[PDB]
């Protein structure tokens, strides 16, 4: 031999990102954490009143 090979290689990016907006789905599921608590919080105390 008396052989040195030092090499590099390249990447294939994974799928599932047609557009970044997809993470806005998380902004949705934030909102259905946002839009859920006050329903019961006023529901049970609406039963109280």
């Amino acid at each position: 031999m008396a052989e040195d090979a030092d090499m590099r290689n390249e990447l294939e990016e994974m799928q599932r990102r047609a557009d970044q907006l997809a993470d806005e789905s998380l902004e949705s599921t934030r909102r259905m954490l946002q839009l859920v608590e006050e329903s019961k919080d006023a529901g049970i105390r609406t039963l109280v009143m």
């Binding site: 599932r16 047609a18 806005e24 789905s25 259905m32």
Partner: peptide, 15 residues
């Protein structure tokens, strides 16, 4: 599954 990613977005916004 861009069909199901777009639905994971859209149907759940409808939810």
């Amino acid at each position: 599954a861009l069909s199901e990613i777009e639905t994971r977005h859209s149907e759940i916004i409808k939810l």
